[PDB]
């Protein structure tokens, strides 16, 4: 039961439209995504309690991203998060 696999596949086709992928490699990728998920959510949880907030916001996800992602990965990551929130809120 893989949450992200069909979505991964769609992202792949947006990147290399003439490239395929095995169900196994989507499975490994799904597992990666789930892991990054869990790590970010758990760090964001810790941050929430620390600042005495009972809501996890885009604020604490952004902070969690910077702790958990390495240097440049994080830099693009927060940029991408800002833009989704930017678009969604419009």
């Amino acid at each position: 039961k893989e949450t992200y696999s069909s979505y991964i596949y769609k992202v792949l086709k947006q990147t290399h439209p003439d490239t395929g992928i095995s169900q196994k490699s989507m499975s490994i990728l799904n597992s990666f995504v789930n892991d990054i998920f869990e790590r970010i959510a758990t760090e964001a949880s810790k941050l929430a309690a620390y600042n005495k907030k009972s809501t996890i916001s885009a604020r604490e996800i952004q902070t969690a991203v910077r702790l958990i992602l390495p240097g440049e990965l994080a830099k693009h990551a927060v940029s991408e998060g800002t833009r989704a929130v930017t678009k969604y809120s419009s």
């Binding site: 992202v11 792949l12 290399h16 490239t19 395929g20 990666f32 809501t55 916001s57 952004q62 990965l73």
Partner: protein, 85 residues
Amino acid sequence: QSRSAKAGLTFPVGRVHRLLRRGNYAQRIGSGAPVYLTAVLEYLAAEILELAGNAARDNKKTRIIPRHLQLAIRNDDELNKLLGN
């Protein structure tokens, strides 16, 4: 339309929002949290996919196999750092 499309995302904001709620991480989940996390996850998958794709092409193949994934990760500093091997 869906929140994913409203956000410009392919990954599932709705599923991610639910996964946060069922995860019991805080008393409440802000409506901006899922939109942001979804975007981060989709961006990471896109990077992993962009290299694994090149590795597949570098090896003259048209299908991504787990060995392509392992090459893509290990040979990138930050992804290697983030995901191990």
